[PDB]
Design a protein around this ligand. Structure first.
Ligand SMILES: [Mg+2]
Ligand SMILES: [Mg+2]
Ligand SMILES: [Mg+2]
Ligand SMILES: [Mg+2]
Ligand SMILES: [Mg+2]
Ligand SMILES: [Mg+2]
Ligand SMILES: [Mg+2]
Ligand SMILES: [Mg+2]
Ligand SMILES: [Mg+2]
Ligand SMILES: [Mg+2]
Ligand SMILES: [Mg+2]
Ligand SMILES: [Mg+2]
Ligand SMILES: [Mg+2]
Ligand SMILES: [Mg+2]
Ligand SMILES: [Mg+2]
Ligand SMILES: [Mg+2]
Ligand SMILES: [Mg+2]
Ligand SMILES: [Mg+2]
Ligand SMILES: [Mg+2]
Ligand SMILES: [Mg+2]
Ligand SMILES: [Mg+2]
Ligand SMILES: [Mg+2]
Ligand SMILES: [Mg+2]
Ligand SMILES: [Mg+2]
Ligand SMILES: [Mg+2]
Ligand SMILES: [Mg+2]
Ligand SMILES: [Mg+2]
Ligand SMILES: [Mg+2]
Ligand SMILES: [Mg+2]
Ligand SMILES: [Mg+2]
Ligand SMILES: [Mg+2]
Ligand SMILES: [Mg+2]
Ligand SMILES: [Mg+2]
Ligand SMILES: [Mg+2]
Ligand SMILES: [Mg+2]
Ligand SMILES: [Mg+2]
Ligand SMILES: [Mg+2]
Ligand SMILES: [Mg+2]
Ligand SMILES: [Mg+2]
Ligand SMILES: [Mg+2]
Ligand SMILES: [Mg+2]
Ligand SMILES: [Mg+2]
Ligand SMILES: [Mg+2]
Ligand SMILES: [Mg+2]
Ligand SMILES: [Mg+2]
Ligand SMILES: [Mg+2]
Ligand SMILES: [Mg+2]
Ligand SMILES: [Mg+2]
Ligand SMILES: [Mg+2]
Ligand SMILES: [Mg+2]
Ligand SMILES: [Mg+2]
Ligand SMILES: [Zn+2]
Lengths: 138, 124, 83, 104, 208
RNA sequence: UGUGGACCCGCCCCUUGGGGUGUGUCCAAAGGGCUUUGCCCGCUUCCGGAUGGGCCCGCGUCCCAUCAGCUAGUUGGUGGGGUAAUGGCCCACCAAGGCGACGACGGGUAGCCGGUCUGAGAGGAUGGCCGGCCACAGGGGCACUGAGACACGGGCCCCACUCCUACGGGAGGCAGCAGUUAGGAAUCUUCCGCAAUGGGCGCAAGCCUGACGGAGCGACGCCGCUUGGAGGAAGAAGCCCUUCGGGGUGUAAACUCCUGAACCCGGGACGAAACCCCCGACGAGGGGACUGACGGUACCGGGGUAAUAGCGCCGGCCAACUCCGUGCCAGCAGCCGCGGUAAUACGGAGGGCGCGAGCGUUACCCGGAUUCACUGGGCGUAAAGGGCGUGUAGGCGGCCUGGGGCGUCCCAUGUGAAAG
C-alpha cells in the first residue's frame, strides 16, 4: 500500500518532469488536490484536472518546462527544479508562524497545512499561522 | 538508521583515549630513575637514543626520553616528566623535563634554551 | 524580620549600594525580595540617589525595618515627609 | 491547578485502589517524531466504583499512602479491555526477553 | 613610541613607505631611496611567489605597523569593530584613526605617530581642556584636542605648529594653529584615507 | 476575669481537615524605666499582614543490558501511634499486592542550577570565582532545648586517633580566618580595621562581629603603561656572507637637540551621616556635634635622570636562509619525516619571521570532525544486510463524510530572581 500518498505525488511529478512528460496522473485525494492548487497558482504546473482512469479517480497534472535550449543537450530547463517532502510519517514536522522557513530567499515556496488550510509560506505567514511543513518547492 | 531507530538507540558518543596516562592527567609527574639505558630507533633510523625507566609518583613505571645533547641521569636520580611521544621509539610516550630536579639543563646551548632548561648566558 | 537596607554592588574603592528589601538573615549581597533604589556614596554622578517613595512606603507599612543608613537615605528622598 | 490526567484501569486486584495507565505524546527532544510514553498511577477508590477497562480521569490529591497521591475523579467511558489487553500481553511478553526460556 | 628599533627596516619589508619618522621620510634618505628591497642578507634575492597566506599576513602587518600598535591592541580593536554595525573594514579604520596619539599626528602637533605618542604620554596634550596621557584614548566627535597650555612654548611644539600654518588638514578634522586647538569633526570614511592597505585582506587574515 | 481561642456533639454554608453557629468543658498575662502620678520599653489571648519554611504532584536530569528480573513494610486496606502537617513515617491486624525492555534491580561515576567555554547553528564540554538550592562538620547512631537544630566552634553512646593522667579516669575535633605539617606538577599574610555596608544583643550609650571593608604575597587572568622623541653616511668599528668587486646588520650606533618613567619636595582627598543631642510631639520638619582601616594612599602642583628585553620559531603544512661544525653519529621530530661529507630539518653563528612583559611547553575542553551525521553520513566490490523464514511487542498506514480537539497552530495572560 502507499505509505505516504503526498510523498508519492511529489515524486510522480519529480519523475515525470525529469523525462519531460506532457503530464502525469496521481491517485485522487482532496488533500493532494489542495496542494496542486498551490503548484498551479504559483506557476510550477500548467494546472491539473480530475480524470477517471480505468474506473478510478485520478488527477492529471499538466507539467511545465522552459524553452528548448542551445548547444549539447537542448533539454528545457525545469520549472520545478526541486520538490521535496519535509514532514513525513515516521517524522512529522510542525512549525510555528515564527519558524516558517524562507525557501531560496523567496524564489521558492513551502507548502504547509494549517488549521486555516493548505498555504504557501508567504500566505500562512500573512494569515499569521503555522502548521505542518508539508513540502518545499523551487 | 530510520528515525525510529535513532529514537530507540540514539547515537553513541565516542570516547577520547588518553595518550599519556601520566595519571590524574596532571601536566607533569615526578618520578625516580631506575634504569638509564640506550635504545635503538626503528624504521629508517639508527642511533643510541637516550632513555630512562621512571618509577612514577602516580604509582606508574614508565620509560621517558631524555632530550638534549648529553645528560647526567643516574640509575637513581629524581626527575620530572611532561609527556610527549618519541615517534622513533615505540613505547616511549613521555619526555623528561630537562632543568628540573636532578636533571641538569643542557650546557652550552644557545638556541632553544627555554626547552632543555638552560639559563641565559652572560656577555660583555 | 524583613529589612530595607543597603547591598554592596560597586567594585573595590568604588562602592555602589543597592537599596533593597530583604530578610534580615540573608547575606547582605544575597537574594533580596525587591530593589527599591540605589545610592552612590561618592556621588560620582548627579544621580547618586534614587528611591521610589511609593514602594519604600509599601514595605514600611507591612513591617520592613530600615537600617539607620537606610532610613537616612529614604528620608532624604522624602519617604517620611508628610507636609 | 491539581493536575488532572486520564487513563485506563489496568489493575483491580487492590482494596480501595485502582491502577490507571496514563499515556502522553510528545515530540522527541532531538529526533522530532511524536513518541508515546506511558505511566501507571495508583489512584484512590473509596467505594471500589471502577473496574478494568474503565477510562477514568485522575486528579492530583493529598497523599493517601506511599505511591497514592491521586484519586479517581470521574468515569469517561467504560468497558474496553482492548486497552487492558495491550498492557497484559506486553506484560506477558516479558517471559521471552530474559535469560531463562519462556513460551512468551 | 612602540616596537623600539629600526623603523625604516619595516617600510623596507613592506615595500611601501609607511611614512613614520617625519622628515627623512621625504628627503632622499628614507632608505626606500637607493634601497627599496627588504632587509637582511637575502633582501635582493629574487623573491619567490608569495603565498595566499603570506599576502594577508603582510597586509595586516603593514596596517598595524603604520599606527605603531601592538597585536594585542590591534586585534582587540578589530574584534570590537567586527561585532559592531557597519562595514568592519571602515569601522576598523575609523577606530584606529580615533586613537588620541593618532589624532595628534593628524593635527600636526607631532611630525610622526611615535612622537605624537610620546607627547600624549608626557602630558603635553589635552582633550576638552583636561590632560589625557593615554595614546589609546578614544577621541569622539566634538572633542577639542589642544596642546597643554604649559607646553605651548616648547621648542618642538613651536616649529611643528609653525609648519602647520597655511597647511591643510584632514576633512574630518580642523585646527586653529593660533590657540593650538584641534577638533575631531567626525569619524573618517574609507574614502578620506589614503592608506597603502587593502583592509579586505586584513578581515580575511582574521578568519583563517 | 474569657475579648477571644481550643476540643467533643449538633445544625448551616462551603466541600477532602475551609467558614459560621449553639450548648458543655478547657486556656491568659511580667514586670521594668524615667526628661514620673504620664509617657516609654515590655507581658497576655486572638484575627490578619509580611517574611522565612515543611510536605506533595506533572515534566526534565550521566555510563554499562557482559547488570533481567526486583520486592514482603514489600503494594494496598482498617485501626492506632507520631508530627506543625499528608503519608507504611512507625506499629498491630487483614488483603496479595507493587515494579520492570516506554530498562525495574544491580554496578560505575557525579552535589544540581543561574551560568561558563566552544560552535554558523543544532550541539559538545563544563558547574572554579559570584548568586540560588541541597548536603555534610573525625566515621556511625541518637535525641534534648527551642518559633526554628536532630544543631561545625551544644549534649549522649559506640569506633579510629591525639592529649593529660596519682591508670581509677579524663580532654579534644580549622570542610571559620590566618598559619603548620603531609600529599602534590601546584595554590598566599600566623597582616590592618570594625571608618563603611550587613548581622546579634541593648531604651541608649555601646559591646561583639577573621561577615565584611582594606592592605600583603604570586605576571595566575584581564586592561592600561614604560624601556624614549626628532635629526644623523650611499653609510664607522666589530661580527658577517662574498663570483673578493662588494653584500648584510643600519639610521641601527656614535653624536646633536627635545621630552622626562623613576626618584625628590609641597599640598592632600571622596568614601561620613547617621545613630546621638537640642528645637519641635521621643512624630514630620529644622539645627548641631562625633566619627577613616585604606593613608600622607589616590589625585593636584613644583623639581628632575634617556632610563629593563625577552621568548619561540625560519624543510612542507606555516610567516622567515645563509655559512660552519657534525657524517644513520650526535641528535631533531605535532603529522609528514630529517641525519650514512656540498644538511635552508641536528649544533652554533650571522641574518630573518612572529609575539613582546612575556614567550614557549605539558595537560585538559570545544572547533575544524557532516569522524554518531537531528540540522548533517552510510552498508554490491572501501567498515557495514541479519543464513532463511514465521511471527509477538512496537513503528508505520488507502479513498469519502461526520463528531471530538489529544498531538499541532493561533491570541491573551502569568512565570522566566539578581549576576552574566
Ligand atoms: Mg604532544
Ligand atoms: Mg628545535
Ligand atoms: Mg614641565
Ligand atoms: Mg573557523
Ligand atoms: Mg468567650
Ligand atoms: Mg465541610
Ligand atoms: Mg464547625
Ligand atoms: Mg462552638
Ligand atoms: Mg510602671
Ligand atoms: Mg511477586
Ligand atoms: Mg494507617
Ligand atoms: Mg493525624
Ligand atoms: Mg500482612
Ligand atoms: Mg541504576
Ligand atoms: Mg563525589
Ligand atoms: Mg555563546
Ligand atoms: Mg558542527
Ligand atoms: Mg550552548
Ligand atoms: Mg548545561
Ligand atoms: Mg573552590
Ligand atoms: Mg556559588
Ligand atoms: Mg533546608
Ligand atoms: Mg578532618
Ligand atoms: Mg520542642
Ligand atoms: Mg571549628
Ligand atoms: Mg612535596
Ligand atoms: Mg561594623
Ligand atoms: Mg553596624
Ligand atoms: Mg633614533
Ligand atoms: Mg557608632
Ligand atoms: Mg520635648
Ligand atoms: Mg534630623
Ligand atoms: Mg637612550
Ligand atoms: Mg620546520
Ligand atoms: Mg614559508
Ligand atoms: Mg658526534
Ligand atoms: Mg655541513
Ligand atoms: Mg647529503
Ligand atoms: Mg641552519
Ligand atoms: Mg560532530
Ligand atoms: Mg562514511
Ligand atoms: Mg566488505
Ligand atoms: Mg541476504
Ligand atoms: Mg545466525
Ligand atoms: Mg490516514
Ligand atoms: Mg496505529
Ligand atoms: Mg476527524
Ligand atoms: Mg488540542
Ligand atoms: Mg504561553
Ligand atoms: Mg514577566
Ligand atoms: Mg536575569
Ligand atoms: Zn621611512
Amino acid at each position: 500500500m502507499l505509505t505516504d500518498p503526498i510523498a508519492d505525488m511529489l515524486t510522480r511529478i519529480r519523475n515525470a518532469t525529469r523525462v519531460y512528460k506532457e503530464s502525469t496522473d496521481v491517485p485522487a485525494s482532496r488533500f493532494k488536490e489542495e496542494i496542486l492548487r498551490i503548484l498551479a497558482r504559483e506557476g510550477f504546473i500548467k494546472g491539473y484536472e480530475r480524470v477517471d482512469v480505468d474506473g478510478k479517480p485520478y488527477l492529471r497534472v499538466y507539467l511545465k518546462y522552459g524553452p528548448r535550449r542551445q548547444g549539447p543537450d537542448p533539454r528545457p530547463e525545469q520549472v520545478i527544479h526541486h520538490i521535496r517532502r519535509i514532514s513525513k510519517p515516521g517524522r512529522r514536522v510542525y512549525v510555528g508562524v515564527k519558524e516558517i522557513p524562507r525557501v531560496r530567499r523567496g524564489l521558492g515556496i513551502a507548502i504547509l497545512s494549517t488549521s486555516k488550510g493548505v498555504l504557501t509560506d508567504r500566505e500562512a505567514r500573512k494569515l499569521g499561522v503555522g502548521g505542518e511543513l508539508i513540502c518545499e518547492v523551487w | 538508521p530510520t528515525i525510529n531507530q535513532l529514537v530507540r538507540k540514539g547515537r553513541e558518543k565516542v570516547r577520547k583515549k588518553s595518550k599519556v596516562p601520566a595519571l590524574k592527567g596532571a601536566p607533569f609527574r615526578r618520578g625516580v630513575c631506575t634504569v638509564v639505558r640506550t635504545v635503538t630507533p626503528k624504521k629508517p633510523n639508527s642511533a643510541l637514543r637516550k632513555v630512562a625507566k621512571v618509577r612514577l609518583t602516580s604509582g606508574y613505571e614508565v620509560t621517558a626520553y631524555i632530550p638534549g645533547e648529553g645528560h647526567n641521569l643516574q640509575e637513581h636520580s629524581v626527575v620530572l616528566i611532561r609527556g610527549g611521544r618519541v615517534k622513533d621509539l615505540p613505547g616511549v610516550r613521555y619526555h623528561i623535563v630537562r632543568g628540573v630536579y636532578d636533571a641538569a639543563g643542557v650546557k652550552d646551548r644557545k638556541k632553544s634554551r627555554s626547552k632543555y632548561g638552560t639559563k641565559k648566558p652572560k656577555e660583555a | 524580620m524583613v529589612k530595607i537596607r543597603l547591598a554592596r554592588f560597586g567594585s573595590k574603592h568604588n562602592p555602589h549600594y543597592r537599596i533593597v528589601v530583604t530578610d534580615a538573615r540573608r547575606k547582605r549581597d544575597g537574594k533580596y525580595i525587591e530593589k527599591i533604589g540605589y545610592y552612590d556614596p561618592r556621588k560620582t554622578t548627579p544621580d547618586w540617589l534614587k528611591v521610589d517613595v511609593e514602594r519604600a512606603r509599601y514595605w514600611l507599612s507591612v513591617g520592613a525595618q530600615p537600617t539607620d543608613t537606610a532610613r537616612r537615605l529614604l528620608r532624604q528622598a522624602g519617604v517620611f515627609r508628610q507636609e | 491547578p491539581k493536575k488532572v490526567l486520564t487513563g485506563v484501569v489496568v489493575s483491580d486486584k487492590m482494596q480501595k485502589t485502582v491502577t490507571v495507565l496514563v499515556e502522553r505524546q510528545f515530540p522527541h527532544p532531538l529526533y522530532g517524531k511524536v513518541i508515546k510514553r506511558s505511566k501507571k498511577y495508583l489512584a484512590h477508590d473509596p467505594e471500589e466504583k471502577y473496574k478494568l477497562g474503565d477510562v477514568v480521569e485522575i486528579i492530583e490529591s493529598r497523599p493517601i499512602s506511599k505511591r497514592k497521591r491521586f484519586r479517581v475523579l470521574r468515569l469517561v467511558e467504560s468497558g474496553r479491555m482492548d486497552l487492558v489487553e495491550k498492557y497484559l500481553i506486553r506484560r506477558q511478553n516479558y517471559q521471552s526477553l530474559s535469560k531463562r526460556g519462556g513460551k512468551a | 613610541g612602540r616596537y623600539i628599533g629600526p623603523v625604516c627596516r619595516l617600510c623596507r619589508r613592506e615595500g611601501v613607505k609607511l611614512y613614520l619618522k617625519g622628515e627623512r621620510c621625504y628627503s632622499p634618505k628614507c632608505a626606500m631611496e637607493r634601497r627599496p628591497y627588504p632587509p637582511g642578507q637575502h633582501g635582493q634575492k629574487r623573491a619567490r611567489r608569495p603565498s595566499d597566506y603570506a599576502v594577508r599576513l603582510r597586509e595586516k602587518q603593514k596596517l598595524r605597523r603604520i599606527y605603531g600598535i601592538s597585536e594585542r591592541q590591534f586585534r582587540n580593536l578589530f574584534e570590537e569593530a567586527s561585532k559592531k554595525k557597519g562595514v568592519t573594514g571602515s569601522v576598523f579604520l575609523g577606530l584606529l584613526e580615533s586613537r588620541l596619539d593618532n589624532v595628534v599626528y593628524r593635527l600636526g602637533f607631532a611630525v610622526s605617530r611615535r612622537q605624537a605618542r610620546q607627547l600624549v604620554r608626557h602630558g603635553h596634550i589635552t582633550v576638552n581642556g583636561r590632560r589625557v596621557d593615554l595614546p589609546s584614548y578614544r577621541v569622539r566627535p566634538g572633542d577639542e584636542i589642544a596642546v597643554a597650555e604649559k607646553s605651548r612654548n616648547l621648542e618642538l611644539i613651536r616649529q611643528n605648529l609653525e609648519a602647520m600654518k597655511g597647511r591643510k588638514v584632514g576633512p574630518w578634522l580642523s585646527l586653529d594653529v593660533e590657540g593650538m586647538k584641534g577638533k575631531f569633526l567626525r569619524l573618517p570614511d574609507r574614502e578620506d584615507l589614503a592608506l597603502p592597505v587593502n583592509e579586505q585582506l586584513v578581515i580575511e587574515f582574521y578568519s583563517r
